[PDB]
Amino acid sequence: MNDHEVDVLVVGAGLGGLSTAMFLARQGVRVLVVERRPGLSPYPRAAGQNPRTMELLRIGGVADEVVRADDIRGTQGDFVIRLAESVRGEILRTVSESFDDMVAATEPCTPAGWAMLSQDKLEPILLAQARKHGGAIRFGTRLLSFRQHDDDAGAGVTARLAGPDGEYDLRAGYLVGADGNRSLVRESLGIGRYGHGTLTHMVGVIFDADLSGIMEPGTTGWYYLHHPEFKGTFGPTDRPDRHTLFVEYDPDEGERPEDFTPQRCVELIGLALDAPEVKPELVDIQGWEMAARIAERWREGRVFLAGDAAKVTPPTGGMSGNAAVADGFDLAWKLAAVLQGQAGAGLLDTYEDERKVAAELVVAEALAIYAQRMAPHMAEVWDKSVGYPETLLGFRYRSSAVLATDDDPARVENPLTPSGRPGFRGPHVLVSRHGERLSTVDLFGDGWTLLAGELGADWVAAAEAVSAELGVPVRAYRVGAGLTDPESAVSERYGIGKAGASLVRPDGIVAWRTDEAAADAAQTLEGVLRRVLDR
Ligand SMILES: Cc1cc2nc3c(=O)[nH]c(=O)nc-3n(C[C@H](O)[C@H](O)[C@H](O)COP(=O)(O)OP(=O)(O)OC[C@H]3O[C@@H](n4cnc5c(N)ncnc54)[C@H](O)[C@@H]3O)c2cc1C
Numbered sequence: 001m002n003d004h005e006v007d008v009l010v011v012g013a014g015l016g017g018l019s020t021a022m023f024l025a026r027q028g029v030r031v032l033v034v035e036r037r038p039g040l041s042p043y044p045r046a047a048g049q050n051p052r053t054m055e056l057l058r059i060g061g062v063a064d065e066v067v068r069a070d071d072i073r074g075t076q077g078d079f080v081i082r083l084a085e086s087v088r089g090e091i092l093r094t095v096s097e098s099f100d101d102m103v104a105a106t107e108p109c110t111p112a113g114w115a116m117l118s119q120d121k122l123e124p125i126l127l128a129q130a131r132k133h134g135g136a137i138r139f140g141t142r143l144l145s146f147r148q149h150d151d152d153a154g155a156g157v158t159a160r161l162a163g164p165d166g167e168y169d170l171r172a173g174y175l176v177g178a179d180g181n182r183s184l185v186r187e188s189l190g191i192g193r194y195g196h197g198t199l200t201h202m203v204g205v206i207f208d209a210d211l212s213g214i215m216e217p218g219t220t221g222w223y224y225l226h227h228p229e230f231k232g233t234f235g236p237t238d239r240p241d242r243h244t245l246f247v248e249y250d251p252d253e254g255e256r257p258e259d260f261t262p263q264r265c266v267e268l269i270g271l272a273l274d275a276p277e278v279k280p281e282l283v284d285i286q287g288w289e290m291a292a293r294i295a296e297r298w299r300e301g302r303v304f305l306a307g308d309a310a311k312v313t314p315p316t317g318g319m320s321g322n323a324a325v326a327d328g329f330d331l332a333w334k335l336a337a338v339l340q341g342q343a344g345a346g347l348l349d350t351y352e353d354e355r356k357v358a359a360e361l362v363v364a365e366a367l368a369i370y371a372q373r374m375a376p377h378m379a380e381v382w383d384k385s386v387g388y389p390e391t392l393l394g395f396r397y398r399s400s401a402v403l404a405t406d407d408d409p410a411r412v413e414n415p416l417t418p419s420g421r422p423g424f425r426g427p428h429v430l431v432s433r434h435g436e437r438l439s440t441v442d443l444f445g446d447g448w449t450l451l452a453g454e455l456g457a458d459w460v461a462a463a464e465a466v467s468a469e470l471g472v473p474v475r476a477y478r479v480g481a482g483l484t485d486p487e488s489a490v491s492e493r494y495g496i497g498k499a500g501a502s503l504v505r506p507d508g509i510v511a512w513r514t515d516e517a518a519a520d521a522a523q524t525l526e527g528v529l530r531r532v533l534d535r
């Protein structure tokens with residue numbers, strides 16, 4: 001039989017696809033992205049990288065390019081978030097007072113912070129890093145259909161593509177559908193979505209205008225507009241002369257995208273800024289229906305949904321791109337481990353179990369923010385916010401790859417007062433290696449990391465015995481030994497006492513822990529690893 005031609009075929013070159021590819025390629029996986037478009041879009045779309053995204057971009061080795069690249073903050077390096085009636089006008093409520101304060105809000109639970117690139121800046125950095133690690137991409141190439149092949153006859157997926165020289169077949173070991181909300185992939189498998197559904201409709205206008213005259217210095221940021229005439233939002237880009245405006249509209253009242261003529265648009269831009277000296281130059285006028293939809297299934301056989309295809313969230317709270325990047329990270333490291341023989345196929349089921357709950361957390365937070373910031377009258381239709389940082393940083397996973405003892409139904413915890421329980425991020429704690437001062441969080445992501453208590457030298461020896469046994473990297477660090485704890489807080493935050501240990505996954509999530517010593521640390525650790533990796 002024939003070697004697959006590629007290990008993974010990723011469909012779509014938005015953030016979900018380029019993430020999955022960059023993190024697959026870094027792991028030595030042969031991955032091909034195909035993209036129907038002739039090139040990456042220059043449009044801003046989703047902007048801003050949250051601290052969880054930043055933690056994964058760090059793992060992925062692109063964090064330093066991300067920080068150097070052009071962001072959307074103003075020339076004074078600041079960014080404000082506000083409800084107002086008009087942009088240059090009087091503030092109804094301030095969500096974030098500055099950028100330094102936005103970062104400050106979660107700094108004690110993470111060493112990563114925020115970045116502020118638009119989608120068109122971030123995608124080129126993903127794509128470049130995928131390519132440097134051996135990934136490949138084909139533009140102007142469209143997926144027509146695919147067939148699947150059971151393990152006897154393969155296993156694999158045969159996909160049919162429409163490129164420039166016409167049609168052809170490609171065999172992959174896996175197919176990832178990162179092909180957007182109207183996903184050819186999801187729709188082809190006949191998978192339904194659930195959730196609130198249509199939320200609202202809005203028209204986006206990207207436009208050019210020098211606001212140097214009508215906006216006071218340092219006033220760059222995101223604005224929720226509650227104007228007598230209209231409902232909307234207003235945003236910066238990475239060019240000081242380019243901006244975005246969104247305006248709500250009712251189709252049931254008879255309003256249509258067609259009504260937002262260049263005229264209406266310049267008019268509403270006039271209104272939003274409360275300056276009519278403005279002559280904008282309109283770049284794009286695009287109607288958008290906002291919704292909340294989650295795929296019933298994130299996987300059928302060797303086909304996976306990732307990104308918007310798996311879940312559409314209202315854009316409110318800037319989580320759209322950040323969730324795709326994270327779906328991709330999860331998919332990557334689990335696919336890599338299975339493809340290399342480090343795990344059995346059972347691990348792939350954790351993808352859905354974990355990222356499908358994450359999708360629900362993201363959507364719920366987005367609806368709640370829509371209510372609090374755009375539609376205060378809707379706050380009851382949906383559960384109240386569980387908290388922004390608890391959703392992005394305090395989230396918990398349950399699956400076969402999380403060995404939890406308790407059964408607390410809570411899906412988040414305060415990330416500022418962490419438990420160290422399985423399923424949550426291993427807590428941020430400042431420690432140092434022999435002089436190098438780092439967060440416990442910066443210790444994660446190569447393969448598996450194990451943290452042992454002061455007395456747990458047996459756990460350290462096990463980390464090597466088990467790596468060798470299973471062929472998985474286990475980096476082990478012991479407190480008071482090769483890892484300095486000045487405040488003596490690692491044991492306490494991770495809940496490992498003096499003699500226990502905490503096993504942390506490739507995405508920085510705690511898989512397992514104990515607060516005491518095992519009878520045979522190597523036997524126990526092997527058993528724990530065999531289980532979460534499906535061996
Ligand atoms: C037009 C547009 C505007 C957006 N604006 C905003 C915004 O202002 N603010 C915000 O926060 N978020 C916005 N987003 C949403 C945000 O971009 C996405 O949530 C983020 O990109 C994650 O989505 P994704 O990559 O999974 O899918 P997408 O970003 O939709 O990428 C899917 C890609 O798959 C490609 N594709 C589709 N079908 C095929 C096929 N059959 N074969 C090959 N390729 C295919 C598409 O060309 C597209 O490039 C917008 C998205 C779109 C599509």
Ligand SMILES: CC[C@@]1(O)C[C@H](O)c2c(cc3c(c2O)C(=O)c2c(O)cccc2C3=O)[C@H]1C(=O)OC
Nearest residue numbers: 045046047048222233235236246315316317318319
């Ligand atoms: C700091 C970054 C941040 O996440 C701040 C905030 O969370 C936010 C962002 C983005 C959007 C919306 C946000 O509220 C938002 O409401 C929205 C919307 O209602 C309708 C369409 C698009 C958007 C939308 O693109 C992100 C941002 O400011 O990017 C420029």
